[PDB]
Design a binder for this molecule. Structure first.
Ligand SMILES: CCCCCCCCCCCCCCCCCC(=O)OC[C@H](COP(=O)([O-])OCC[N+](C)(C)C)OC(=O)CCCCCCCCCCCCCCCCC
Ligand SMILES: CCCCCCCCCCCCCCCCCC(=O)OC[C@H](COP(=O)([O-])OCC[N+](C)(C)C)OC(=O)CCCCCCCCCCCCCCCCC
Ligand SMILES: CCCCCCCCCCCCCCCCCC(=O)OC[C@H](COP(=O)([O-])OCC[N+](C)(C)C)OC(=O)CCCCCCCCCCCCCCCCC
Ligand code: SF4
Ligand code: SF4
Ligand code: SF4
Lengths: 158, 382, 87, 62, 135, 181, 318
C-alpha cells in the first residue's frame, strides 16, 4: 500500500474535508415558519457566520440546500429545478417536520409527503419548528458527515 | 412592455409577474398558490381542540393572536365565560405577540431596503420574547397556549419581573432603532410617497389593520368592538395623515409603544385568581383532581376523546391581529367537528393592494411595497 | 521615460498570474449620460495643464479658464433645465 | 477588555502585507543598483548617473 | 508543559472554539466533572445572562453535543440549577441505561433500525394471519 | 395635481420664516449630521460586547415546560407505565401515533406495538396532557438529527422505552410542574 | 534585468493575501457592528477562513459557460484584474519605495479607472441573458459619472501642488495634510470612491442582479472589485491624508518606519468603508444618478473654482 503514501493520502483527505467543512455555503428554501427560525439561527444569538456559513442566494455557487418549510405540489418542480442547477458536491438539510415526512398536512392533498421524494435529503432535522439550537446541531452533524469523506483515497484506489 | 418575472432576505415564497415599460411597473400580478395545504379541509376532518394548532400555524409570525381569535369564536358560539386572570394574561400575551410581529416586519422591511443592523438588533429582542413564550408554555414559536375558555397552564413565578426588565430595556431599544432609521435621508427618500392609497380605494380593496389606519380613517377593532379587557386598558391608537410607506412605518413604531403601555398596565392589575373555566365539561380538570376524584376522570376522558359539542348556529369573529382583521367563520352544527371553518386573513386584501398600488413605480419600489405590506404567504394561502 | 518598461513588465506578469489563477480549478438616458461625459471629460483634460502652471501665468490664466468654465456651465444649465439628466 | 482587537487583527494583517509589499521592492532595488531609488529623475540626473558610472569604471580599471 | 499542551491546549490553534472556551476558563471557576471526563464551569458574575454556565467536553478532537449526560444537560440548559452530582444522587435504580451520544452516522449497527427494516437482525413479518402450512 | 403646487408653496413659506432657520436647515442637510449620528451609534455598538452564544460549548436557556424527544417512563419498580388507554392516539392532532395492545400472560394489559413517526409528530404537547398515568412525556432533548428518515420513525416502543436514559432529568421537570398543571 | 520581475511578484502576491484577509476582516467587523462575532471557528481567530474558502472554491466542480466560450468570456475577468493591478503599479509606500516614478501618475490612475469601466461592460455583455446586459449598462453609467466627479477632485488637489508624480504630492502634504483644509473635498472624494466601486449605499445594480457564472470567474470578478477598493482607499490616503508622514512632527514618531503610517491610514479607510456599509440603506438607481449629475458635479466644480481663487490671490501658489 506504500504505507507512507497511504499516510500522505490520509492527510490530503483530511485537508480537503477540513476545507469543505469549514467553508460550507448553504442555500435557503424558506417555504414556511421554519424560515423564521432559520433566520433566528442566522441571527446574532446562535451565529452562523461564525462557523463559516454564508447564505449565498444564487444556486450556481452554493453547497447545501436547506429545505425549511413545507413543500407543495405546485412548488415541487421549482425545487427540483433549483436543486439540479447546483455544482457536484451537494447536501440537503430538511428543516421542520413537513419538509421531511409530510408532517402535519401530510394527511392532505396538495402537499408532498416530505421533500425526500424530490431531492435526496442528506440529514433531515426534527422540529416544529426546530429550536435554533437544533438546526445548528443539524448543521454540525452535516459537518460530522462531510468529515468522514475520504475522497482522494477513493480516486487513488479507483 | 416587457414581461419580467420575480421569484425571490427570505421574504416568503411568491411569484410576481410584471408587465413593465422601461423602469415602470405597468402591471404587477402575484401568483400565490405556491404554498397551499388545505387547512380548512383538515380542520373539518378534525375537531376543535385538535384544530387549534392549525390556527397557530396560520400567519406564523404573530403566533398567538390567531389562537386568540379562534378561542373567541368558539366561546361566542358556545356561551362560555372566562375568568379575569385568564383574560388579563391573554391580553398580555396578545400584546407581546404584536410587538414580536412588528419587530420582524419592520426590520425585514429595513433589510429589503438595505439596512442590516436593525434586523439583527430586532432579532435579539425577538429572541428575548420567544424565550418568554417557551418559558410560559411550549416551544419558542407555535405555543398552543390559548384554548377555548382561557389558557392551558398558569404562568410561572418571576415571569412578571422579567416582563418589567424587558419593558424598560425595550423602550430604550425602540428609541435606538427609530434614531437609526427615522431621519436618515436615504431611508426617507426611499420610503416617502411610495405607494399612496386614498381612503376610498382603501375601504374598497378592503384593507385592515395598519394599512386601513395608514391613510386617514381611524378604525381598529380594539376600540370599535372591544372584545376583551381592553376597556380598562386605555391606549392611544395612532393614525397616519397621508397614507404611504413612511406613515405606515411611523404607525408601526407608535403601535409598538402603545403595546408597551398595555404590557405594563396588565402586570399592575392582573387579578390573581383562577384560570380557564368553572365547568369540567368545556375545560378539562387538572391533574390532582383527575387522579383523585372520580367524575373528574370521566370528564377528562370524554373531553380528550370526543371534545365538547357546540350547538347549531354559525358565527363570524374578528380580531385585531398585528396585520389586520383576522376573521374566522364557523358553521358548526351539533357534533364536535367544526363544519366549514373559514379563514379571513388580511393577505388577500393586501395582495390585491399590491396589484393596484404598485403601478407607475420601479422595482425597488415594488420591493418596498411588499415590505410595507408585511405579507406572510402562510396566511395569504393557508 | 524608462518607467513604462517596469509598467509593461508588470502588465505581462499580471497576465501570467491571472491566467495561472484562472487555470487552477480545471436608452436615451444612457446615450445622453455618455454624451455629457464626453463633454465634461475634455473639461478635466483641459484642467490638467491649467492646474500645474498657475504660477507662470498671472490672473490672465485664471480668468481665461474661468471663461471656458462659464461657457460649459451655461451648457450644463441648458442641459439641466431641459431635464436630460433627470433619469 | 480587548474584544475589539479581534476585528482589527484581520485588518491589521493587511497593514503588514502592504508594508511588506513596499519594502520588498525597495530592498530589491537596493541590491540591484547599490543605493535606494530616486524619486523624480529628470534628464540631468540620468546623464549624471551615466557619466558617474563611466568615470568610476575608468578609475577602477586604470 | 507539552503534555497538557498536546492534551487539551494546542488543538485550539486550528479549532477556534477551544480558544474562546480557554478565555472563558481563565475567567472561570469550576463546578463539576462528569464520568465522561468533561468539566462544567460557571463564571457567574457581571458577565451576562446567556453565557455564564458552560462545559469543556474533555474530547478535544471530536467533541460533539449530546455527549452531556442528562443531569448536566439540565444544569447546562438552565432548566434547573441542580448540579449533576445531585441529580445523580437521585439516579433511578432497578433499571437504567448509560448515556450514549447520538451516533447516527457510525455504521448501521451502532445506528439502529425498526423491526421490519432489512438491516435489522430482527426483520419481523407483518401478516395478521397464518398459512395452512401442511407438513 | 394643482393642489400639490399650492401645498409645496405653503410648506416652503412655513419653514423658511427667518434666516437662521434656512441657514440651519441648509448646513444640516449639507454636513450630514444625521449620517454622523448614525455612524456614532453604530461605532458604539461595535465597541460594546456581543451575544454570540458560542453554541457547542454553552447552549441556550430553556424551561421545564419544554417539548422535544419523547419518552416512555416507568414506575420505580421497573414496571412499565403505559396501559394502552388509546388516549394519546385519540388526541393526536396529527395522527402520528400507532398503538396496538393485547392482554399479557400474567394478566395485566400492555402495548404490543407503540410508535410515533417523529416527523408526522409535530411537537404540540397534547401527549403529556392526555395521559392519565404520565406514561409518555416530552423530555428536554432536542439534539437528535439522524441522517435517515427511518430513524425519525421512532421504533415500536423500543427506542421510546430508551427515553428512560433521561429518567432522572425528566423526573425533575415533572416535580416542578406538579404544582401548577 | 531580473530585479524587475522580482519586484512585480512582490507587489502582486501580498496584494492577493491582503485582499483575502480584507474580505475576511470585512465580515468580521460588520459582525462586530451588528452585535455578533464573525467567522471564529476555522482559524484560531477565524484567520484560516479565507484559505478554507479558497480551497473550497478550488475543489468545487467547475461549470464552463455556454456563451462565446473563448477569447471573449474567459478574458474579460482577466482584463479587469490586469487593470486593477496595473493601477496598483504606481503607488508610493515610502520615500522612493515605489515601482515606477511615472511623472504623470494622476492621469494614469484616471485612465486606468476608465479602462476598468471597459472591463465591467464587456464582462457583462459577454454573457447570454439580457438582464445582465442592462445591469452592465447601469453600472457603466454610474461608474463613469462618478469618475468625472473624481476627476474634478483630482484637479483640485493638483492645483494645490505643482507636479503630478505622487511622491511630490506627499511632500506637499508633509507640510500640512490636504485633508485638513479641504475636508469637504475629502468627503466628496470618499463618496465618489464609494459610488465608483458600488460598495456601501449604491448597490442597486448588483442588488437587482441578485434579484433578477463560472466559479473561478466570479472569484476573479469579486477579487477585482475588492482590489480596486483597496486601490481607491490607497490613493485617497496618498493624496488627501499625508502618505507615510508622522503627525505632529515630533522625533519619537520618526522611529516608526514611515511605511507603517501608510498602512495605518489605508487600514483606517478600509474600516471606514466597511463601517459606512453597515449603517445605511441603499439608494435607488434614479436617485443615484441624479445625485451623481446634480450634487457632486456642481459641488466639485465650485470647489475647484474656490481653491484656485484663494490660492491665486496671495503668493501661496508654487
Ligand atoms: C496537522 C495540523 C496542521 C496545522 C493546522 C491546520 O492547518 O489544520 C487544517 C486541517 C486540520 O484538520 P483537522 O483538525 O480536522 O484534523 C487534524 C487533527 N490533528 C491536527 C490533531 C492531526 O487539516 C489538516 O491539518 C490537514 C493535514 C495538514 C495539511
Ligand atoms: C495580540 C492580538 C490580540 C487580539 C485579541 C485577542 C482576543 C481578545 O482580546 O479577547 C477578549 C478577551 C477579554 O474579553 P473576554 O473574551 O474575556 O470577554 C469577557 C468580557 N470582558 C471583555 C469584560 C472581559 O481578551 C483576553 O482574554 C486577553 C488575554 C488572552 C489572550 C489570548 C491570545 C491567544 C492567541 C492564540 C493564537
Ligand atoms: C470658502 C469655502 C467654505 C466652505 C465651507 C463648507 C461648505 C461645505 C459644502 C460642501 C459639503 C460637502 C460634503 C457634503 C456633501 O457632499 O453633501 C452632498 C449630499 C447632500 O445632498 P443630499 O442629496 O443628501 O440632499 C438631501 C436630498 N435632496 C437633494 C433631495 C434634498 O450628500 C448626500 O447626498 C449624501 C449621500 C450619502 C453618503 C453616505 C456616506 C457618508 C460617509 C461619511 C460622511 C461623514
Ligand atoms: S410545523 Fe412544519 S409545516 Fe408547520 S410552519 Fe413549521 S416547518 Fe412549516
Ligand atoms: S394515554 Fe398514556 S398510557 Fe394511555 S395509551 Fe397513551 S401514553 Fe399510553
Ligand atoms: S406530541 Fe402532539 S403531534 Fe406528537 S403525537 Fe403527541 S399529541 Fe400528537
Amino acid at each position: 500500500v506504500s504505507k507512507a503514501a497511504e499516510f500522505v493520502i490520509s492527510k490530503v483527505d483530511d485537508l480537503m474535508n477540513w476545507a469543505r467543512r469549514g467553508s460550507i455555503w448553504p442555500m435557503t428554501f424558506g417555504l414556511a415558519c421554519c424560515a423564521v427560525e432559520m433566520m433566528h439561527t442566522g441571527a446574532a444569538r446562535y451565529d452562523l457566520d461564525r462557523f463559516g456559513i454564508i447564505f449565498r442566494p444564487s444556486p450556481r455557487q452554493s453547497d447545501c440546500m436547506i429545505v425549511a418549510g413545507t413543500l407543495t405540489n405546485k412548488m415541487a418542480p421549482a425545487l427540483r429545478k433549483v436543486y439540479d442547477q447546483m455544482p457536484e458536491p451537494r447536501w440537503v438539510i430538511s428543516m421542520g417536520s413537513c419538509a421531511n415526512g409530510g408532517g402535519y398536512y401530510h394527511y392532505s392533498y396538495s402537499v408532498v409527503r416530505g421533500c425526500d421524494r424530490i431531492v435526496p435529503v442528506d440529514i433531515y432535522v426534527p422540529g416544529c419548528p426546530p429550536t435554533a439550537e437544533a438546526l445548528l446541531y443539524g448543521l454540525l452533524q452535516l459537518q460530522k458527515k462531510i468529515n468522514r469523506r475520504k475522497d482522494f483515497l477513493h480516486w487513488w484506489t479507483k | 412592455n416587457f414581461t419580467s418575472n420575480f421569484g425571490p432576505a427570505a421574504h416568503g415564497v411568491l411569484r410576481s409577474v410584471l408587465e413593465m415599460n422601461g423602469e415602470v411597473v405597468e402591471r404587477a400580478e402575484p401568483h400565490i398558490g405556491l404554498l397551499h395545504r388545505g387547512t380548512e379541509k383538515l380542520i373539518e376532518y378534525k375537531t376543535y381542540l385538535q384544530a387549534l394548532p392549525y390556527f397557530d400555524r396560520l400567519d406564523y409570525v404573530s403566533t398567538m393572536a390567531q389562537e386568540h381569535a379562534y378561542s373567541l369564536a368558539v366561546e361566542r358560539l358556545l356561551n362560555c365565560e372566562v375568568p379575569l386572570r385568564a383574560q388579563y394574561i391573554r391580553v398580555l400575551f396578545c400584546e407581546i405577540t404584536r410587538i414580536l410581529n412588528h419587530l420582524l416586519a419592520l426590520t425585514t422591511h429595513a433589510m429589503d431596503v438595505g439596512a442590516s443592523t436593525p434586523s439583527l438588533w430586532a432579532f435579539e429582542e425577538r429572541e428575548k420574547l420567544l424565550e418568554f413564550y417557551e418559558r410560559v408554555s411550549g416551544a419558542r414559536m407555535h405555543a398552543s397556549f390559548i384554548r377555548p375558555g382561557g389558557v392551558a397552564q398558569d404562568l410561572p413565578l418571576g415571569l412578571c419581573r422579567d416582563i418589567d426588565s424587558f419593558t424598560q430595556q425595550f423602550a430604550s431599544r425602540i428609541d435606538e432603532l427609530e434614531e437609526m432609521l427615522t431621519g436618515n435621508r436615504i431611508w426617507k427618500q426611499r420610503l416617502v410617497d411610495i405607494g399612496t392609497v386614498t381612503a376610498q380605494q382603501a375601504k374598497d380593496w378592503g384593507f385592515s389593520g395598519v394599512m386601513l389606519r395608514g391613510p386617514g380613517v381611524c378604525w381598529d377593532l380594539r376600540r370599535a368592538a372591544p372584545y376583551d379587557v381592553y376597556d380598562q386598558l386605555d391606549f392611544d391608537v395612532p393614525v397616519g395623515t397621508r397614507g404611504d410607506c413612511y406613515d405606515r412605518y411611523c404607525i408601526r413604531i407608535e403601535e409598538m409603544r402603545q403595546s408597551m403601555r398595555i404590557i405594563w398596565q396588565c402586570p399592575n392589575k392582573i387579578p390573581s385568581g383562577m384560570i380557564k373555566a368553572d365547568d369540567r365539561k368545556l375545560c378539562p380538570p387538572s391533574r390532582c383532581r383527575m387522579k383523585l376524584s372520580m367524575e373528574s376522570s370521566i370528564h377528562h376522558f370524554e373531553l380528550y376523546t370526543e371534545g365538547f359539542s357546540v350547538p347549531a348556529p354559525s358565527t363570524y369573529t374578528a380580531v385585531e391581529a398585528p396585520k389586520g382583521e383576522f376573521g374566522v367563520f364557523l358553521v358548526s352544527n351539533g357534533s364536535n367537528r367544526p363544519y366549514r371553518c373559514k379563514i379571513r386573513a388580511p393577505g388577500f386584501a393586501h395582495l390585491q393592494g399590491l396589484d393596484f398600488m404598485s403601478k407607475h413605480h420601479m422595482l425597488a419600489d415594488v420591493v418596498t411595497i411588499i415590505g410595507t405590506q408585511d405579507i406572510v404567504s402562510g396566511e395569504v394561502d393557508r | 521615460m524608462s518607467e513604462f518598461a517596469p509598467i509593461c513588465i508588470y502588465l505581462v506578469i499580471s497576465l501570467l498570474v491571472s491566467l495561472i489563477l484562472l487555470g487552477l480549478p480545471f436608452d436615451i438616458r444612457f446615450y445622453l449620460v455618455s454624451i455629457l461625459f464626453i463633454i465634461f471629460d475634455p473639461e478635466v483634460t483641459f484642467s490638467f495643464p491649467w492646474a500645474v502652471s498657475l504660477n507662470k501665468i498671472d490672473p490672465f490664466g485664471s480668468w481665461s479658464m474661468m471663461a471656458f468654465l462659464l461657457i460649459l456651465t451655461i451648457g450644463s444649465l441648458y442641459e439641466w433645465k431641459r431635464g436630460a439628466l433627470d433619469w | 477588555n480587548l474584544r475589539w482587537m479581534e476585528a482589527v487583527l484581520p485588518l491589521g494583517i493587511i497593514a503588514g502585507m502592504l508594508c511588506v509589499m513596499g519594502n520588498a521592492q525597495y530592498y530589491i532595488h537596493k541590491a540591484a543598483h547599490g543605493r535606494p531609488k530616486h524619486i523624480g529623475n529628470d534628464l540631468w540626473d540620468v546623464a549624471m548617473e551615466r557619466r558617474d558610472k563611466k568615470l568610476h569604471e575608468q578609475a577602477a580599471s586604470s | 508543559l507539552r503534555e497538557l499542551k498536546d492534551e487539551g491546549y494546542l488543538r485550539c490553534l486550528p479549532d477556534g472554539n477551544l480558544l474562546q472556551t480557554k478565555i472563558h476558563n481563565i475567567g472561570a471557576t469550576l463546578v463539576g466533572v462528569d464520568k465522561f471526563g468533561n468539566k462544567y464551569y460557571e463564571k457567574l458574575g457581571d458577565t451576562q445572562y446567556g453565557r455564564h454556565r458552560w462545559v469543556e467536553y474533555a474530547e478535544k478532537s471530536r467533541y460533539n453535543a449530546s455527549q452531556v449526560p442528562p443531569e448536566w444537560h439540565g444544569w447546562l440548559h438552565f432548566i434547573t440549577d441542580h448540579t449533576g452530582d445531585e441529580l445523580l444522587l437521585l439516579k433511578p435504580k432497578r433499571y437504567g441505561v448509560e448515556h450514549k451520544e447520538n451516533l447516527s452516522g457510525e455504521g448501521e449497527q451502532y445506528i439502529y433500525h425498526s423491526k421490519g427494516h432489512a438491516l435489522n437482525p430482527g426483520q419481523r413479518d407483518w401478516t395478521r394471519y397464518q398459512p395452512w402450512e401442511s407438513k | 395635481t394643482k393642489l400639490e403646487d399650492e401645498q409645496r408653496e405653503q410648506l416652503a413659506k412655513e419653514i423658511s420664516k427667518d434666516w437662521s432657520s434656512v441657514f440651519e436647515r441648509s448646513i444640516n442637510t449639507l454636513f450630514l449630521t444625521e449620517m454622523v449620528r448614525g455612524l456614532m451609534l453604530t461605532l458604539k455598538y461595535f465597541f460594546e460586547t456581543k451575544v454570540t452564544i458560542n453554541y457547542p460549548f454553552e447552549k441556550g436557556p430553556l424551561s421545564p415546560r419544554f417539548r422535544g424527544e419523547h419518552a416512555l417512563r416507568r414506575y420505580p419498580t421497573g414496571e412499565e407505565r403505559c396501559i394502552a388507554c388509546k388516549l394519546c392516539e385519540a388526541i393526536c392532532p396529527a395522527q402520528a401515533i400507532t398503538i396496538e395492545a393485547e392482554e399479557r400472560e400474567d394478566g395485566s394489559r400492555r402495548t404490543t406495538r407503540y410508535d410515533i413517526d417523529m416527523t408526522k409528530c409535530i411537537y404540540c404537547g397534547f401527549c403529556q396532557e392526555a395521559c392519565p398515568v404520565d406514561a409518555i412525556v416530552e423530555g428536554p432533548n432536542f439534539e437528535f438529527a439522524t441522517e435517515t428518515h427511518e430513524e425519525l420513525l421512532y421504533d415500536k416502543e423500543k427506542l421510546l422505552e430508551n427515553g428512560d436514559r433521561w429518567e432522572t432529568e425528566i423526573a425533575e421537570n415533572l416535580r416542578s410542574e406538579s404544582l401548577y398543571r | 534585468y531580473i530585479a524587475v520581475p522580482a519586484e512585480i511578484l512582490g507587489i502582486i502576491l501580498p496584494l492577493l493575501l491582503g485582499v483575502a484577509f480584507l474580505v475576511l476582516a470585512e465580515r468580521k467587523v460588520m459582525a462586530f457592528v451588528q452585535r455578533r462575532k464573525g467567522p471564529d471557528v476555522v482559524g484560531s481567530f477565524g484567520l484560516l477562513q479565507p484559505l478554507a474558502d479558497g480551497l473550497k472554491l478550488i475543489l468545487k466542480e467547475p461549470i464552463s459557460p455556454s456563451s462565446a466560450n473563448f477569447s471573449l468570456f474567459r478574458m474579460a475577468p482577466v482584463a479587469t484584474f490586469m487593470l486593477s493591478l496595473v493601477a496598483w503599479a504606481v503607488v508610493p509606500f515610502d520615500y522612493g519605495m515605489v515601482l515606477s516614478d511615472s511623472n504623470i501618475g494622476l492621469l494614469y490612475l484616471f485612465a486606468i479607472s476608465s479602462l476598468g469601466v471597459y472591463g465591467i461592460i464587456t464582462a457583462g455583455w459577454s454573457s447570454n441573458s439580457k438582464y445582465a446586459f442592462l445591469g452592465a449598462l447601469r453600472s457603466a453609467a454610474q461608474m463613469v459619472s462618478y469618475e468625472v466627479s473624481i476627476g474634478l477632485i483630482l484637479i483640485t488637489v493638483l492645483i494645490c501642488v505643482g507636479s503630478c508624480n505622487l511622491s511630490e504630492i506627499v511632500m506637499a502634504q508633509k507640510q500640512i495634510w490636504f485633508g485638513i483644509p479641504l475636508f469637504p473635498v475629502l468627503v466628496m472624494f470618499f463618496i465618489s470612491c464609494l459610488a465608483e466601486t458600488n460598495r456601501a449605499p449604491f448597490d442597486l445594480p448588483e442588488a437587482e442582479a441578485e434579484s433578477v457564472y463560472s466559479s473561478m470567474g466570479s472569484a476573479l470578478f469579486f477579487l477585482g472589485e475588492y482590489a480596486n477598493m483597496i486601490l481607491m482607499s490607497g490613493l485617497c490616503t496618498s493624496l488627501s491624508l499625508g502618505g507615510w508622514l508622522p503627525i505632529l512632527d515630533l522625533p519619537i514618531f520618526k522611529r516608526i518606519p514611515g511605511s507603517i503610517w501608510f498602512s495605518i491610514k489605508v487600514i483606517l479607510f478600509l474600516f471606514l468603508y466597511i463601517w459606512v456599509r453597515a449603517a445605511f440603506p441603499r439608494y435607488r438607481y434614479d436617485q443615484l444618478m441624479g445625485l451623481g449629475w446634480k450634487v457632486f458635479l456642481p459641488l466639485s466644480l465650485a470647489w475647484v473654482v474656490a481653491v484656485s481663487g484663494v490660492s491665486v490671490t496671495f503668493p501661496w501658489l508654487p
